[PDB]
Amino acid sequence: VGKIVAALNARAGRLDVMSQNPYNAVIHLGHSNGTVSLWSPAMKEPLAKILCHRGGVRAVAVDSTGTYMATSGLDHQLKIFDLRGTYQPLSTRTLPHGAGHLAFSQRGLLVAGMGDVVNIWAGQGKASPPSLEQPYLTHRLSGPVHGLQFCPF
Amino acid sequence: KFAYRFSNLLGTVYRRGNLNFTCDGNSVISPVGNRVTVFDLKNNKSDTLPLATRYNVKCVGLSPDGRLAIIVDEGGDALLVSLVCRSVLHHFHFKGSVHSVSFSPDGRKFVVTKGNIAQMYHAPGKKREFNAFVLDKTYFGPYDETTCIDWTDDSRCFVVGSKDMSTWVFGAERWDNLIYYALGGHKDAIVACFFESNSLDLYSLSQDGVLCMWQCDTPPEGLRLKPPAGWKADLLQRKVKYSRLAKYFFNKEGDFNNLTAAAFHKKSHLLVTGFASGIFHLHELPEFNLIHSLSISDQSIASVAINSSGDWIAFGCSGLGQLLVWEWQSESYVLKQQGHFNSMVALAYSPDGQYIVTGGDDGKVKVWNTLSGFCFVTFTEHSSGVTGVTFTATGYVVVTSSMDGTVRAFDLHRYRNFRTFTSPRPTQFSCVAVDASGEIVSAGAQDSFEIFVWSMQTGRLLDVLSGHEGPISGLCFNPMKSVLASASWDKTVRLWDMFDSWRTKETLALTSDALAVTFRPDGAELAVATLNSQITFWDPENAVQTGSIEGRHDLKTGRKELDKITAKHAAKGKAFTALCYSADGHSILAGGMSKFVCIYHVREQILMKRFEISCNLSLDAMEEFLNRRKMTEFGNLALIDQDAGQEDGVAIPLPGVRKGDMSSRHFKPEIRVTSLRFSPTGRCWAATTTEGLLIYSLDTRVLFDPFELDTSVTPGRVREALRQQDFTRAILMALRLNESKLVQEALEAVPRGEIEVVTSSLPELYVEKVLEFLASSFEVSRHLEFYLLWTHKLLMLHGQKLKSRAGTLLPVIQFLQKSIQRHLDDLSKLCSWNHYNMQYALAVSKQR
Amino acid sequence: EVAPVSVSDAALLAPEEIKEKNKAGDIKTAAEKTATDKKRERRKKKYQKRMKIKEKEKRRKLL
Amino acid sequence: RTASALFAGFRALGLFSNDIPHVVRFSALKRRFYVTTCVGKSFHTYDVQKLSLVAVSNSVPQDICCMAADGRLVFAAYGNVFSAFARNKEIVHTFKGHKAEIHFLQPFGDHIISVDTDGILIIWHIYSEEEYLQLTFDKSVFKISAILHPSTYLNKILLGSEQGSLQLWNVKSNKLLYTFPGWKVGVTALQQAPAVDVVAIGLMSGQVIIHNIKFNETLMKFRQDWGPITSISFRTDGHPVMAAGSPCGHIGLWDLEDKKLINQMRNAHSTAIAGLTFLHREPLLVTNGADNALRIWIFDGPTGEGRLLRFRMGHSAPLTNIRYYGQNGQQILSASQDGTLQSFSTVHEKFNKSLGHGLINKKRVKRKGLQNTMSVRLPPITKFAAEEARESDWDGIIACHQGKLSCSTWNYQKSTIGAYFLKPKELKKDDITATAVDITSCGNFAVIGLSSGTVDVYNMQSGIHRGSFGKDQAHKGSVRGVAVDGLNQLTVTTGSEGLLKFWNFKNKILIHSVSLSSSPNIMLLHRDSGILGLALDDFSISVLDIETRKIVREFSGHQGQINDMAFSPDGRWLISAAMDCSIRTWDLPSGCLIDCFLLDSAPLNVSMSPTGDFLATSHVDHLGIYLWSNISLYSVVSLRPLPADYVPSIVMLPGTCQSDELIEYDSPEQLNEQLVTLSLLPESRWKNLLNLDVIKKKNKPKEPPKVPKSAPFFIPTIPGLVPRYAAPEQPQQSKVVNLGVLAQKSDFCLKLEEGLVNNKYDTALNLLKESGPSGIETELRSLSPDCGGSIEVMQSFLKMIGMMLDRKRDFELAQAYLALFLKLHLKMLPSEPVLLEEITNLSSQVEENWTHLQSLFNQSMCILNYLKS
Amino acid sequence: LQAAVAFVEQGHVRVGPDVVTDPAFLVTRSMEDFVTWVDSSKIKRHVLEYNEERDDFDLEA
RNA sequence: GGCCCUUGCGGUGCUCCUGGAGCGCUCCGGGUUGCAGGUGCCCGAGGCCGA
């Protein structure tokens, strides 16, 4: 239609971390406090606040089915969260460098962009989260990573 | 002949960078745009170092011993200099932008933080190599740009703040218990981070205004070396914890005042912090006790430093370029100066040559003392900018004309604006001119096209001179004849006679539009700059053109970043706009919109010399051919850098403003020499440009100028004559050479009582040389009355003969006079203050 | 301006402003005043009253 | 110790490549190739992507003989010792222990193999620098000429000989595995083929033998009739192509699959091939040579015809003449025997540029290229003069060639030859040649001399003759030099007959003539000072002033022909380079020798920077320009007059980093006892004592600082820059004490008390002149009886003042401090009688001293004012 | 209007002695009286040639 | 002036080092990362016109 339906004040300072859940259609917002806020255009307050890191969050990405969330922060920890009512971190790993960006494919693969290096973690995915034990593929870019996305099909 | 060297840059005290005190704590090192100035508060002095750079100085690293310093510009070029010798040692190029440089307290290592990394280098050694700094180690911790550096007093570990709101601590060499450690607990960018006096406990300050204290369990001597391993073991065969004790807030909730600068003195446990609102706070860290706080300016505080003793704190505000030194215990200012960038447009000298008055677009009139280099009186009566300024020929009176429509006169005896002249019609004045007698004041308008003339003593409008068509470019009174010459844009220069019963007027027609008019010091020749870049020399009394000078090619002008046209096409439409005769009048100085000032020989109509004002490449239009490296397929893309530069804030850039805060092109102004002036003394000259006020002074080192050389003339024969007591011949041979040290020795060798014989034997030609050397001597010589006797004898012997040729000796006498004046005045203040007072005491004892 | 040394030392206020001086620069008591001196003061006072009436009356017309 | 005093070598300019072969080095953390080339006493590193300089190494005392690279480090050998370079710049490890020059270097893991000339082979551990293993081979039986470590072989190295035998060795077991009989020609090159067990062997006869070392069969043989095979490389991008170098500079491409010659590259380099290498998995060839060239070749054209892709080049022939161009000083103009003009930047090599070859009929060169147009090529440039003014509008360089009548012109911004050939119209033959050229300051006119003795003036913009000096010819003999004054007022020329003539530039009228003792050789004029320098055939140098046309200085001491001369920008130093391989600096104001340092090679040209930082020299057979730093700028140097008949014992290498006569005088503290003298103590310290209170009051802010009420009473304190009180306290002592322990008298007051006994107040004087005005006022205020100072002590301060008036030194301090003291205690003063007797002495002394000075001051000013009116 | 914007970018118009290249430049009623062709511009050559008032001495100089 | 398979004549296709703007690599080393207070920004067309 071309009309602004909502304009909401997150009330958390600068906003730099954002992703949506395709199954859920809610918006996730990361903050330097370490919390991720669930937003909807109808409400003037966030649906929920989820404390994920001991420092500031710099990335958030959730899968197509809407089951898991992947977040990374300043404490150099990669976390996988269960979004089906429990909101506990299913997987945890400490990293040498920092995961600046994250994404999911349509089969459940997760890629983290750290510096000039990308790493992809794969799991069986059949009602299970990605296994962060050992990466699936590696590749070294010419420069530092600024954007990641999977082709749909 | 024309041997002048750059001596000082007045008018600017702070542009950008960090401030540093010298090791002893008496002097302050301040970056002024392209250069670096040292202000010596101990002796009330300011000196700009001779070094220049391609771009503005971003970082200054000062060595603990005080001998060495590292100066880095924005482009990444670094310069290793000695403060003792005030000379550049060597050059280097850091690959990327450096946020800061800090020397280790021991003096062996220094850390350079650049990009996302911090590289630690060794200190430069006595050995000279093509590569100055030998890189030692690299650390690659943070997510984002590193900001600040601090070192432990034991030089065992250092700490680096980062933009990613984490603070990293590293070890100088690999410790088994501490290789690196990371700290969080913040939600905004780290501004500074410090260490305790004798422990590894640290402080972290965020841009939000939060202070965090971190304490470790391990004493700094507890650090242990890693056990040797690898290949050293083959030769031999044959963690700590941090806890957050406290978190403090510098601001009340609901107020967003960003912390911008911080400094911390370890021995006194003192913190000084400057905020975006222009206020600074003092605290005692372990208890966080607010001692007192001040408001410095409306603009933010960019850099803050504290001296070794802890008594003085340095503040810089880049909004107005304001520099302040504050002594907290005495609750008083030691130094406080302010100068806006690109403000100055006007210039003048006092008749003595001791003071310089300037006015700017801001509307402020400032008087500077050239010897000290500091402003000492400022007049703010004018509301809009000052276009012109002038001293009266006799008194200590300064006259200004402004866009307010007012011409105001100020006295230096009482520091008041005693007379103000305004037109009956609301008009804006563009320049001022005052007669040598000082009775007549004159001004010209932007729009009313007519010259207004007022009386000084009465203050009424004597007359309105009309006849010009178009605005008046400039005015000047003849110094000896009391006639007024005014140039206008109708290709004419008109001469007006004031003390003439029949109101005789003259016109001088020109091929193109006129821009400036100046008289020679004697007043018998006149110079007009025209729009076709020609300087024409006329004889005013006979209205005949003596000569012409073509100067279009000499004004090398470069293309601006946004110009579609090339350098040559723009140059075809630009001419000279500032002219100034030398003290003798044999040479003329011309300047305009370029980094060059051209000195021409008027009689030969040839260019003797070209002076380069600046080499700063962060100023627009400096270089003729823009760099091909920056070009892309869609153009040079200047607007991205334009937005990055205008991100400074403070105001909002407005379309169509050429100059000022509202002008979009303010971060990188064009290079322009607004005005030139020459000292009446003749020992220096000055120029007002965008960079500031520039002083060029006589220096014997620049050029060798003997008078009459011979194979016999040599210092060996000079000292041989000295040993033979033939003083006169030694003096003559020492004067035939123009070395100051030899003639100094030759004069000081003579014992008293033989002075008059030497003076009588001197020929007429050498008299001027001896007077010049004596005048130079009174400034820097301990032996006052020796040179007093010399001057007294030569003057009493040759005054009558010098009277006939007094016309050509004016620059010399002026010089001599002021020197002989200077010392005298202070003695006349002090000795009499003793004498009479003592006599008064001797009176009271008698009445008892 | 702020500086550790002062270039010019002055009263900042003119000597006439501190103590006002008559045009003649001398003051005479009523006893000393001669015949002409009293006549001049009478002449000046009548001279002032005359012109002030003209200025007040002119101002009255403008209103 | 150091041969010179004023000068030291800094860097070389214009040199890119030499005979030492290059090495190609892959890097970790950066997926790129780097190629390292030796340059004299250093080396340079370039990325192969764009041939951009990335690092310049530190200098070594001797010329590098052999080079090696192993990814992490770069190894360089000079003399009998070799070192390892880290970060491509700075040495971290040096290895001594060889008595002969190193001729081969082979990096072997963490160990390095060095082979000496006499026949010693030693393996060194890099980091520990210890000697692992040493072997010797008989020089007559087996002299090593090639070293190779085949890939995929554990601890095995293959050694070849000039005799023709090959030996395979194992370093770890230290035994001879096998001996190859080989061929009687002798081995000159070894290379690893793109196979597990195959090598390529070069021979001195021009034959390359590709061999399998495991089973000893020869796969194929190729023969080039160009001399010994310098280097061999293999193409690994999927095409079986082999390239082998030759000392003629030619390259032959052999087809490995069909055992045939593909094509031959002719004149890839003018000089001998140093090293050629195919880049890994690339169709690229990297070649360098002794002609100061580095080239990249790509084989992508039809028939695999290689074409030049990139290059970095300097002068390929010895230099003739060099000169700084421009007043900024970042660029130098140089001409060489190859017949081209080039510009070299002194800050970075990216601003280097070439002006091209001398070419008549330029449009012909466009159609047919540089080659096949050799006839129109011009002879090499011998002399030239350039001026920066008017360079944008028209030409600014005039140059005279070897044995040619005409003079050529050059354009800087266009970076090509000019449009005029300047000559007299009448002459056409080349029997007469042009000898001396000069260009005027304004840049309009150029003055050309001839061997016949005629001097002409031409306009630079149009090239039209503007007249000539003399009725028919200026000089009888050849014109050696011409010069034009800066103001275009006097033109001075020289002749072979020995006459020096001065002319008017405008109307061309002779003024004066000077005879010379010997024939002048070279001539230069320092325009701004007006100082003219002459070098004569009798090895002396004569200096004369152009204005008075008379000799001012004579310099002798050179033992050879003087080649070129140079002036410092200030005009105080004359630098002359001679054939005796010495560069001498003369001090014009004194006329005595200051510096003389010897050189390995005779210097041809010398020129001083316009800024004065650097000195540039060029040599007889070297291809580059060498810069020498003037150390007077960055350090203080005391000039010392050397004896005239001096020969420098110590030689200084070019490219490596490592009395009554003089004029200086120091003024004594006092010329005479009766003379009044003043100190140069800063003005702010003593002139503001009487007005101190009001000066401090204005400094305080308009609005006082905001102080919180909760703030405590005690805040930390800094005692001050100078201690007014001598003793703060008498490790773990008590801090609660009774009276009589803490200091109760100021250090100044203590010194004053001692001054009474011995009549000496110098100690108190030093404290008084060191403390600042705020401190001085406090000290004098403390002197009062109320503040704790006895009236006896105030008597001491009055006697201090009197003493300074008898010595008549520090006169301004005497008046300043006494004035403050009078202001403070005037009310107490007349009551106490003792202080009066000091005043009566003091009052007389200040009266007689001021009155004598006040008269001398007043008579001076009144005379000066009378001169004004 | 596209021609008018073109001229200021190519530096053919001056306001007084100063030549301005910024299209965003508001001109005062007084200053609009002194906008004219800069000297030695090809457009002023065309105008003077049309009016039969072209002399090479003054323009080129 | 010189040119001799030439031209007062013309055209093409590649190469020619980003100031900040391809950072990080001798050795050593990197492991046990051990919820203060935020309400923004945008919204005016009338011609002392030219064709």
Can you read off the two tokens belonging to residue D92? Answer: 């971290």
**DSSP SS3 for C50:** helix
Which three-class secondary structure state does DSSP give residue D537? coil
How close, in Å, is residue A9 to chain B by CA atoms? 16
C-alpha D727 chain-centroid distance? 54
**Block residue for tokens 């998995």:** D281
Counting Cα atoms < 13 Å in the Cβ hemisphere of D535 gives 22
D762 contacts: CB under 8 Å, gap ≥ 6: none
CA D698 – CA B377 distance, rounded (Å): 13
Tell how far CA B697 is from the center of its chain: 14
Q: Say which residues have a Cβ less than 8 Å from residue D724's Cβ, sequence separation at least 6.
A: D746, D747, D748, D771, D775, D778, D779
Question: Beta strands D353-357 and D381-386: pairing type?
Answer: unpaired
Is it the case that chain B and chain A have 3 or more CB pairs lying under 8 Å apart?
A: yes
> Tokens 């890994």 map to which residue?
D280
Shortest-distance nucleotide from B617 CA to C1': F19
| Cα–Cα distance measured from residue B783 to residue D671, given in angstroms and rounded to the nearest whole number | 7
Q: C27 CB near a chain B CB, below 8 Å? A: no
Q: Provide the 10 A C-beta neighbour count for residue B698.
A: 17
DSSP string over B154-209:
TSSEEEEEETTS-EEEEESS-BSS-SEEEE---SS-EEEEEE-SSSS-EEEEETTS
Q: For B630, which DSSP code?
A: G
Q: Which chain B residues have a beta carbon less than 8 Å from that of C7?
A: 369, 376
Contacts of D486 in chain B (CB under 8 A): 608
- E58 CB neighbours in chain B (<8 A) are 511
A-chain residue closest to B143, CA distance: A98
The answer to whether B461 touches B440, Cβ cutoff 8 Å, is no
- Picking from D32, D435, E30, D195, the residue whose alpha carbon sits closest to that of residue B430 is E30
Backbone torsions φ then ψ of D321, nearest 5 degrees = -145, 140
* Binding-face residues of B in 294-313 toward D, CB within 8 A: 294, 309-311
What does chain E come to in residues?
A: 61
Structural tokens at position D619: 């040599």
Two tokens, residue D355? 């002006």
- Amino acid, res. D689: L
Method by which this entry was solved: cryo-EM
CA nearest B600 in D: which residue? Answer: D487
- Minimal CA–CA distance to A49: which of A31, A68, A66, A67? A31
Confirm if B500 and B514 have CB atoms less than 8 A apart.
Answer: no
Nearest-angstrom CA–CA distance, B257 and D702: 24
Take residue B301 and report the two structure tokens written for it: 């505080």
Residue D711: strand, helix, or coil: coil
What is the rounded CA–CA span in Å between residue B275 and residue B298?
A: 11
In the three-class reduction of DSSP (H, G, I as helix; E, B as strand; rest coil), residue B71 is classed as strand
Residue in the block written with tokens 């005080």: B66
**Does D839 contact B838 at a Cβ distance shorter than 8 Å?**
yes
With a CB cutoff of 8 Å and minimum separation 6, the contacts of D117 are D100, D101, D102, D103
CB D189 within 8 A of CB D201: yes
What backbone torsions phi and psi does residue D73 show, to the nearest 5 degrees?
Answer: -130, 165
Residue C8 contacts B where some CB pair is shorter than 8 Å: yes
**In contact, D824 and D784? CB cutoff 8 Å:** yes
State the count of interchain CB pairs (< 8 A) between A and B.
Answer: 24
Chain E, nearest residue to B577 by Cα: E17
Rounded CA separation B738/B747 (Å): 14
Q: A137 is written with which tokens?
A: 């593929």
**Residue D863 to residue B82, Cβ atoms within 8 A:** no
Question: For chain B, how are helix, strand and coil distributed in percent, rounded to 5?
Answer: 15, 40, 45
Distance, first Cα to last Cα, chain D: 63
Q: What's chain C's length in residues?
A: 63
Tell whether B403 is within 8 A of chain E (Cβ).
Answer: no
d(CA B471, nearest CA chain E) in Å: 9
Contact yes or no for B377/B412 (Cβ under 8 A): yes
List the B83 CA – F23 C1' distance (angstroms). Answer: 32
Look up the protein residue whose alpha carbon has the minimum distance to the C1' of F49.
Answer: E1
The residue type at D23: V
C-beta separation of D720 from D730 below 8 A: no
Residue whose pair of structure tokens reads 């049309």 in the numeric block: E50
Query: E33 at the B interface (CB within 8 A)?
Result: no
Give the H or E element holding residue D791.
helix D791-807
Under 8 Å between Cβ of B106 and B122: no
For an interface test with E, which of B427, B488, B491, B531 has the most E Cβ atoms less than 10 Å from its Cβ?
A: B531
Q: Which residue is nearest to nucleotide F41 (CA to C1')?
A: A7
Q: Which nucleotide in the DNA or RNA is closest to residue D34, CA to C1'? A: F25
d(CA B451, CA B446): 10
Burial of B364-399, coded b for 16+ CB within 10 Å and e otherwise, reads bbbbbbbebbbbbbebebbeebbbbbbbbeeebbbb
Cβ atoms < 10 Å from Cβ of B84: 11
* Angstrom distance (rounded) from CA D767 to CA D778: 13
Q: Does C6 sit within 8 Å of D691, measured CB to CB?
A: yes
Would you call B96 an interface residue with chain A, using a CB distance cutoff of 8 Å?
A: no
* Partners of D11 in beta bridges: D627
Q: Which residue is nearest to nucleotide F18 (CA to C1')?
A: B629
Place of tokens 């470069």: B558
Alpha helices, DSSP H, located in D654-746:
683-686, 692-699
Rounded-to-integer distance, Cα B794 and Cα D859, Å:
12
Q: Residue D268 in contact with residue D310, Cβ under 8 Å?
A: no
CA of D463 to C1' of F10 (A): 27
Please check whether residue D574 is in contact with residue D556, taking contact to mean a CB–CB distance below 8 angstroms: no
Q: What is the DSSP letter of B220?
A: G
Interface of C with D in 9-38 (CB under 8 A): 9
Q: Which two tokens stand for residue D597?
A: 């340092």
CA B360, B366, B372: angle at the middle one, nearest 5?
130
Rounded to the nearest angstrom, the gap between the alpha carbon of residue D77 and the centroid of all alpha carbons in its chain is 25
Q: CA D496 to CA B815: how far, in whole Å? A: 50
Q: Protein footprint on strand F: which nucleotides are under 7 Å from a CB? A: 1-4, 6-12, 14-40
Counting as contact any 3 or more CB pairs under 8 A, the partners of B are A, C, D, E
D255: exposed, middle or buried (Cβ count in 10 Å: 0-12, 13-18, 19+): middle
CA of D297 to C1' of F13 (A): 17
Side chain identity at A144, as an amino acid letter? P
> How far, CA to CA in Å, does D710 sit from each of B50, B269, B281, B656, D707?
50, 19, 15, 53, 9
Task: Determine, for residues B489 and E14 on separate chains, whether the beta-carbon distance falls below 8 Å.
Answer: no
Q: Which phi and psi (to 5°) does residue B608 adopt?
A: -75, -40
Inter-chain CB proximity D705 and B293 less than 8 Å: yes
E strands within B489-566? 492-497, 505-509, 514-519, 526-530, 534-539, 544-550
Q: Which residues of D touch C9 (CB under 8 A)?
A: 691
- Residues D144/D160, Cβ–Cβ less than 8 Å: yes
| DSSP line for D168-202 | EEETTTTEEEEEE---TT-EEEEEE-SSSSEEEEE
Measured between CB atoms, does B184 come within 8 Å of chain A? yes
Residue B731 phi, psi (nearest 5) = -60, -45
Asked if residues B308 and B25 have their Cβ atoms less than 8 Å apart, the reply is: yes
Buried b (16+ CB within 10 A) or exposed e, D598-627: bbeebbbbbbbbeeebbbbbbbeebbbbbb
Among residues D558, D592, D563, the alpha carbon closest in space to that of D577 is found at: D563
Q: Within an 8 Å CB–CB cutoff, is residue B565 touching chain E?
A: yes
Centre a 10 Å sphere on the Cβ of residue B43 and count the other Cβ atoms it contains. 14
Distance, in Å, from the CA atom of A138 to the CA atom of A145, rounded to the nearest integer, reads 13
Cβ-Cβ contacts under 8 Å, A100 against chain B: 143
Residue D91 token pair: 């040495």
Question: What type of residue sits at position D598?
Answer: L
| Sheet architecture: strand order including D198-203 | D187-192, D198-203, D207-212, D217-223
State, as a whole number of angstroms, the distance between the CA of A135 and the C1' of F4.
76
Straight-line distance from the first to the last Cα atom of chain B, in angstroms, rounded to the nearest whole number: 68
